[PDB]
Amino acid sequence: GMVTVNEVSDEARLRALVDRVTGLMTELGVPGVAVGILHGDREYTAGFGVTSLENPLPVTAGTLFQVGSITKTFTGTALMRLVEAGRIRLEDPVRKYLPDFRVKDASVSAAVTVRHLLTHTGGWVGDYFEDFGLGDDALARMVAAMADLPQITPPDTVWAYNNAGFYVAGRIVEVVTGKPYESALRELVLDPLDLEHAYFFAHDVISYRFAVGHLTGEAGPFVARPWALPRCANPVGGLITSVRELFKYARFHLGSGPNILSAEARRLMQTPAGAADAGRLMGITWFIQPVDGDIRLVGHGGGTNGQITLFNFVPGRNFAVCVLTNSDRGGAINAEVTRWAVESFLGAAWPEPEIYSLPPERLATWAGRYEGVLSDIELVLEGDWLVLKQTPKGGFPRKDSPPRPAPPPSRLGFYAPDRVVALDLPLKGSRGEFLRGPDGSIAWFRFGGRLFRPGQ
Amino acid sequence: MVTVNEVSDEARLRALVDRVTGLMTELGVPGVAVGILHGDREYTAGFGVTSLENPLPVTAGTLFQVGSITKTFTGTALMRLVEAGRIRLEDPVRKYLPDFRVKDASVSAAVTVRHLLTHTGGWVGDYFEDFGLGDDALARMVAAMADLPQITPPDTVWAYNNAGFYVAGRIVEVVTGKPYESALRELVLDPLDLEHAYFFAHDVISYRFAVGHLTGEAGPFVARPWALPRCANPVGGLITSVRELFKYARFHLGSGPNILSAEARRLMQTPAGAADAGRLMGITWFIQPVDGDIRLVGHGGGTNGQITLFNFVPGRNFAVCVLTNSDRGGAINAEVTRWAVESFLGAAWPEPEIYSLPPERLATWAGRYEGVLSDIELVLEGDWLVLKQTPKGGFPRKDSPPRPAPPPSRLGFYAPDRVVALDLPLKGSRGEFLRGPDGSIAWFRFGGRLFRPGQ
């Protein structure tokens, strides 16, 4: 059962895209993929596949997807909204607005600022997902539950993707505004930017065209259940929107949109506040990726229960690209579509780092167990290559949800000292870094933004 | 030309599929789902599409908003707490809700649980607002009922009372110590093995569901908002399919597991008095006599563009199910139910005989009639009285816009002070003029709701 090509705005221009994507989906098993490209006054949209495997409908440019972690930028934009009005400062401590907030470390609980949450420099355990109902008290109970959150590293030491840090970021918006986050996000960002179809609950998306998530196991893909994230995770990644609205979001952040943030504040979100992971830079919620001289990708990735998305934009060039898939393997599509649009519309040259292996005597020093909070990473020496074998521990989306189907193993190839990238689909493209301790021993293995402790 | 999706028995339902395929193109309903249970044989029939913007074939497993049918589920939970010796229908409400209050002080102290389940409260029945998506939504609504005025004193004039089930549902919450949606699972839903019986959009979204359709001037369109307030879940927030309503039907026929005693279900199906339009009122059940010993026991359902109907005949292992996703599906709810009764049991449907009234006599019933959710105008046209409904809004939410008014319908008499509409989509709805002791018209009961004569 091959994939469908539902809608293509320009057929001749996106012809290479149509064939490049229509191929991958057959490979990975992605049920549906929505693409949107922006270049000056022109907008290029393309829809592939079906919304659901059980309930198929053609994926279009207006199809509603769960953009996932892209919502963090909306939370940051809403916070910078409050910074411009003189109500919040990024250097202010969190306890200035939530005096009851606390994590396991008391010294960190009193020194963490708003800037720490938006730059993932808190240091506590990030991937922490519980459910506290569907009422407006869900987010306030999430933050109070963070009192047991242990410290992985002290703050401002080793960069770590922090989902839990945005519970506080959204809760700060709740307190300073005095309204629920979903209403406040709608008040400061959605309504002024004319984001018509941008929702947080399933009771607003049912009557339209939406996508469901898919997990792929041995015998193929299947619908991912449950479809909805906990309400307390909405400031983290609970937004549901389409390509046509992500275009409006891109125009604003490119300086070509309305002024809910002055240009000065918008460029501050896109100024590197420090290093992130895998050669990326950390803005204010924004990820910055150097490419070709002045050309650098600003954006963020997304991923819920079976819905993997990506959003990027080039400042001063009026360029943007959105890719929204409904499979746990759509990240491979997210990368190739983003790369082609930059190489096709901006004519840039991409930094393809040289892939190499090492003598197996050295590779044996990297193999072993690597323990995370959401999954395990398993490196074993097979042939002249190191192979990554991931194993989800369970706990997503709910604390009782089952372990998701593990992806097929992939070979690891070095492109720099202590830096690797996966060479086989569907993990192909994900970079990793071995952070070593003061004695020279492996202290962490950062992969996908998360830190894994060497167990051996 | 409407696609036929599923038929369990094409031969036995040969005449059925033809009647529905024609009735859908006439009224404009996008999809219906039919389920017939007779003995050990079950007959299902899938029809049409789940949506006009996003069609999908409707099957027996397609999730429909059964609407006010949920009231029967709420009464089943309370009747389960009846058997456990936890609650009593004759007990006042304040025994379980000591803070409960309506505008009338005496009624607040005398209303019982039986009053809630039999629509005999007397306060304003149609009262809807929103208090969030949390487990506190039902508590804030019952507390907001402290201002609901009295239309009539209790046990005087029967009237449909949605509000009473806010309290009847809240009584389940306090007695069990769980949310109302959870308490229903623990009491009836899970004991009867009905997985696909949900209340929230976030649980139905991953499956096949039907969206509501409203019929306006430019034709039918997808009804927004799809969602009902969480506090209205004890009123009519249940979402399920035909496959699950069979087990629910089988249970009340006795051919299911006994979470309720046999005499309890019989006491639920026993008429506790007269309701509206010749129907009888049991414990949440609506009883309509048709022929001899055969009686239709069931309930209607109505949400934002989804009309449903569920009836069963005790003593015959018989039950019918018709779920439509458009506001004009009521004629198909009656037609399929009417056909199924005398096709599988062989009875004779009570088709009322109509007689005409001179215009000098009809003019005594004409005038303006004011209601809560809609307005009624009775107009003399030729040798007939014409009903004109004018909704004012407030459904599903207190700020929702008024729905398109249904086409007017002529009114024909079948008994003194008793009418029945003759034109679609109102064809079949009977009305009643209740006369005060002084002989003047006190109320016009239409659609189970009361209307005051205009001043």
Side-chain angles (χ1 to χ4, degrees):
Chain A
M2 323 333 288
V3 317
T4 323
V5 186
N6 316 324
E7 188 254 337
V8 188
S9 63
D10 192 324
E11 294 275 20
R13 179 87 189 74
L14 300 191
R15 198 214 164 138
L17 181 98
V18 165
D19 274 278
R20 227 172 278 239
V21 193
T22 201
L24 273 160
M25 328 194 40
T26 309
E27 273 215 74
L28 313 169
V30 189
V33 160
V35 184
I37 304 182
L38 214 68
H39 200 14
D41 287 25
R42 305 249 172 130
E43 339 183 333
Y44 305 78
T45 68
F48 308 89
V50 297
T51 44
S52 152
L53 274 195
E54 297 165 3
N55 305 269
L57 285 179
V59 163
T60 70
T63 298
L64 295 182
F65 280 82
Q66 271 177 2
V67 302
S69 312
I70 304 191
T71 321
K72 305 189 161 81
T73 88
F74 290 76
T75 291
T77 299
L79 271 161
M80 300 278 337
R81 180 24 191 85
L82 289 169
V83 178
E84 250 195 12
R87 316 211 36 211
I88 300 188
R89 269 161 20 211
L90 273 196
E91 40 271 9
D92 279 342
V94 162
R95 286 217 162 121
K96 177 158 171 82
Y97 308 98
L98 329 169
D100 73 343
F101 164 75
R102 187 208 202 93
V103 300
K104 228 184 200 150
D105 208 342
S107 291
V108 187
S109 296
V112 61
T113 75
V114 188
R115 200 185 272 281
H116 280 114
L117 317 156
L118 309 186
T119 65
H120 309 250
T121 55
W124 51 74
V125 165
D127 302 338
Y128 185 61
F129 293 109
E130 303 217 29
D131 192 15
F132 287 101
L134 321 168
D136 317 52
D137 55 324
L139 195 38
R141 295 160 74 182
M142 207 34 240
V143 174
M146 278 166 77
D148 331 299
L149 256 197
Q151 283 286 341
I152 282 169
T153 67
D156 309 55
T157 62
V158 178
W159 184 91
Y161 192 51
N162 221 346
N163 266 335
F166 281 85
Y167 294 128
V168 182
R171 172 70 188 152
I172 291 167
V173 187
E174 281 213 342
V175 152
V176 191
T177 315
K179 321 173 47 95
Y181 170 88
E182 298 84 346
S183 298
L185 197 277
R186 185 130 271 281
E187 187 150 66
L188 314 164
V189 189
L190 301 194
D191 280 331
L193 285 171
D194 286 358
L195 261 70
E196 241 168 34
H197 297 72
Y199 313 115
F200 278 108
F201 318 100
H203 68 73
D204 293 321
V205 304
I206 271 180
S207 63
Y208 304 94
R209 205 184 223 81
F210 65 95
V212 315
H214 290 87
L215 315 177
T216 288
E218 265 149 55
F222 56 83
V223 191
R225 273 144 186 134
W227 171 96
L229 295 173
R231 176 184 179 142
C232 52
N234 288 332
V236 198
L239 193 67
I240 319 176
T241 187
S242 86
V243 167
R244 300 272 161 162
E245 311 268 300
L246 281 177
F247 277 176
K248 297 185 181 181
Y249 192 51
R251 302 297 206 189
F252 153 71
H253 273 282
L254 290 181
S256 346
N259 326 74
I260 54 146
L261 258 46
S262 39
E264 204 203 14
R266 280 187 238 123
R267 323 256 182 70
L268 184 59
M269 312 200 45
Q270 310 165 47
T271 325
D277 65 340
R280 275 128 36 102
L281 287 299
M282 181 45 84
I284 296 171
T285 70
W286 276 130
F287 284 105
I288 308 206
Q289 177 183 207
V291 183
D292 181 295
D294 44 347
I295 282 271
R296 41 184 27 91
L297 282 198
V298 204
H300 205 293
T304 63
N305 204 20
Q307 295 191 56
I308 306 275
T309 54
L310 197 52
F311 175 83
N312 287 85
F313 63 112
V314 178
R317 289 289 269 277
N318 308 289
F319 172 89
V321 47
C322 328
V323 194
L324 302 106
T325 81
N326 65 338
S327 201
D328 55 343
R329 286 134 182 252
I333 297 190
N334 281 354
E336 313 221 19
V337 187
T338 294
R339 204 186 240 76
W340 178 81
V342 171
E343 255 165 356
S344 212
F345 287 83
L346 308 185
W350 172 278
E352 271 290 343
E354 284 275 40
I355 276 294
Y356 62 92
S357 202
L358 283 319
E361 175 248 4
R362 263 295 101 179
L363 289 164
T365 82
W366 283 286
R369 262 48 92 201
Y370 291 92
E371 283 167 359
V373 316
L374 280 209
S375 64
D376 325 290
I377 272 175
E378 180 77 68
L379 312 186
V380 293
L381 192 270
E382 322 218 83
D384 317 296
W385 292 100
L386 221 65
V387 186
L388 191 141
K389 295 215 237 300
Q390 247 193 296
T391 315
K393 273 179 160 171
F396 185 83
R398 312 273 212 203
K399 208 178 185 177
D400 179 48
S401 265
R404 305 121 280 190
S410 161
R411 287 170 314 155
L412 276 196
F414 288 79
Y415 65 90
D418 270 350
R419 305 217 199 140
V420 299
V421 83
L423 303 187
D424 286 331
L425 294 162
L427 266 156
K428 176 151 100 73
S430 316
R431 268 114 67 191
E433 183 162 2
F434 285 100
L435 309 117
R436 300 192 176 267
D439 66 340
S441 315
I442 314 198
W444 313 99
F445 174 47
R446 178 157 56 204
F447 185 69
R450 272 85 158 197
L451 284 304
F452 294 74
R453 192 177 66 242
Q456 304 293 69
Chain B
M1 197 33 249
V2 145
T3 46
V4 156
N5 311 104
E6 283 183 351
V7 278
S8 100
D9 204 286
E10 213 157 72
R12 184 87 175 72
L13 310 181
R14 263 313 289 142
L16 197 286
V17 279
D18 298 31
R19 199 73 253 289
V20 200
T21 36
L23 260 205
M24 294 200 253
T25 326
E26 182 178 344
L27 315 177
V29 323
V32 317
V34 183
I36 287 186
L37 154 80
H38 178 208
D40 291 45
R41 310 287 330 282
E42 315 188 326
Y43 313 95
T44 61
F47 289 108
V49 299
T50 66
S51 175
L52 275 193
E53 288 175 10
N54 309 262
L56 262 155
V58 186
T59 67
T62 301
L63 294 168
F64 275 88
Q65 283 181 354
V66 286
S68 320
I69 287 199
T70 319
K71 294 179 163 79
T72 60
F73 287 80
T74 304
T76 295
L78 285 168
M79 279 310 282
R80 259 220 75 174
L81 303 166
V82 152
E83 223 146 272
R86 306 225 257 165
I87 77 99
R88 188 19 67 86
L89 311 147
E90 279 51 50
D91 280 342
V93 163
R94 305 185 125 165
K95 167 187 178 211
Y96 322 95
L97 267 43
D99 54 24
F100 168 73
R101 193 191 158 67
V102 306
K103 190 254 207 152
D104 185 277
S106 302
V107 163
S108 279
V111 53
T112 86
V113 183
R114 187 184 217 82
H115 278 96
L116 311 170
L117 305 190
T118 61
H119 302 286
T120 54
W123 51 66
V124 170
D126 289 341
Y127 173 73
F128 314 111
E129 206 190 347
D130 199 343
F131 294 103
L133 296 325
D135 301 46
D136 63 329
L138 198 45
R140 300 199 253 156
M141 170 54 104
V142 178
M145 266 162 118
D147 322 298
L148 269 205
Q150 287 277 127
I151 291 165
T152 60
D155 278 294
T156 59
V157 168
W158 187 95
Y160 207 67
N161 200 334
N162 286 324
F165 281 85
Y166 289 139
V167 188
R170 178 80 171 117
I171 288 167
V172 184
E173 283 217 329
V174 182
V175 161
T176 43
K178 325 174 185 135
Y180 166 75
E181 302 89 8
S182 290
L184 215 44
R185 283 231 82 77
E186 262 77 345
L187 285 162
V188 45
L189 289 189
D190 268 341
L192 293 213
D193 306 286
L194 322 150
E195 34 183 333
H196 311 88
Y198 309 102
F199 284 99
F200 311 117
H202 61 75
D203 281 331
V204 182
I205 197 138
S206 31
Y207 301 112
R208 179 153 308 191
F209 49 85
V211 317
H213 288 100
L214 295 206
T215 294
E217 284 340 295
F221 59 90
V222 167
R224 318 226 153 84
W226 181 97
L228 249 68
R230 189 187 170 159
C231 54
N233 275 357
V235 165
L238 186 58
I239 306 124
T240 189
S241 74
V242 185
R243 291 310 193 151
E244 312 288 54
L245 282 153
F246 281 158
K247 330 195 200 274
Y248 189 66
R250 261 218 180 78
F251 161 69
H252 295 271
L253 315 175
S255 70
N258 277 336
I259 40 153
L260 292 179
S261 86
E263 58 142 23
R265 296 185 295 278
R266 303 209 327 277
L267 190 62
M268 296 203 43
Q269 285 147 30
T270 288
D276 61 330
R279 261 184 309 188
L280 305 168
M281 191 60 208
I283 302 285
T284 69
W285 286 118
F286 274 95
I287 314 152
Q288 183 132 252
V290 282
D291 183 22
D293 74 321
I294 291 164
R295 291 217 227 121
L296 287 208
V297 172
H299 211 134
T303 58
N304 197 21
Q306 296 182 57
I307 326 290
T308 47
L309 193 59
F310 166 85
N311 321 80
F312 64 88
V313 172
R316 322 283 318 246
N317 235 335
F318 186 76
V320 198
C321 215
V322 187
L323 330 172
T324 77
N325 61 346
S326 101
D327 60 345
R328 310 231 162 158
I332 320 185
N333 292 358
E335 204 89 305
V336 179
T337 296
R338 181 227 284 278
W339 172 93
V341 157
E342 76 217 311
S343 182
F344 291 88
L345 322 168
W349 184 265
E351 175 204 289
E353 268 52 48
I354 320 281
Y355 57 84
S356 72
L357 265 275
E360 71 251 10
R361 267 231 266 174
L362 287 171
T364 64
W365 288 282
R368 186 138 317 201
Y369 292 96
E370 314 254 320
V372 167
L373 298 203
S374 59
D375 261 0
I376 271 174
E377 192 85 9
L378 285 190
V379 173
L380 197 72
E381 286 211 323
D383 358 33
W384 314 90
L385 218 49
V386 169
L387 209 154
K388 294 159 181 293
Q389 279 236 57
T390 307
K392 340 168 117 181
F395 190 63
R397 312 186 200 205
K398 210 180 204 174
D399 326 312
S400 34
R403 281 210 242 162
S409 271
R410 291 130 71 240
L411 278 194
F413 289 77
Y414 63 104
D417 274 321
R418 305 198 165 68
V419 302
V420 52
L422 327 161
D423 311 319
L424 302 156
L426 282 161
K427 190 167 109 183
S429 22
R430 328 176 173 101
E432 203 166 37
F433 291 87
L434 306 156
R435 300 228 159 226
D438 62 333
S440 67
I441 286 138
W443 309 103
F444 174 47
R445 213 208 269 128
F446 181 75
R449 276 136 205 162
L450 298 166
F451 291 81
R452 184 174 260 208
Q455 260 263 340

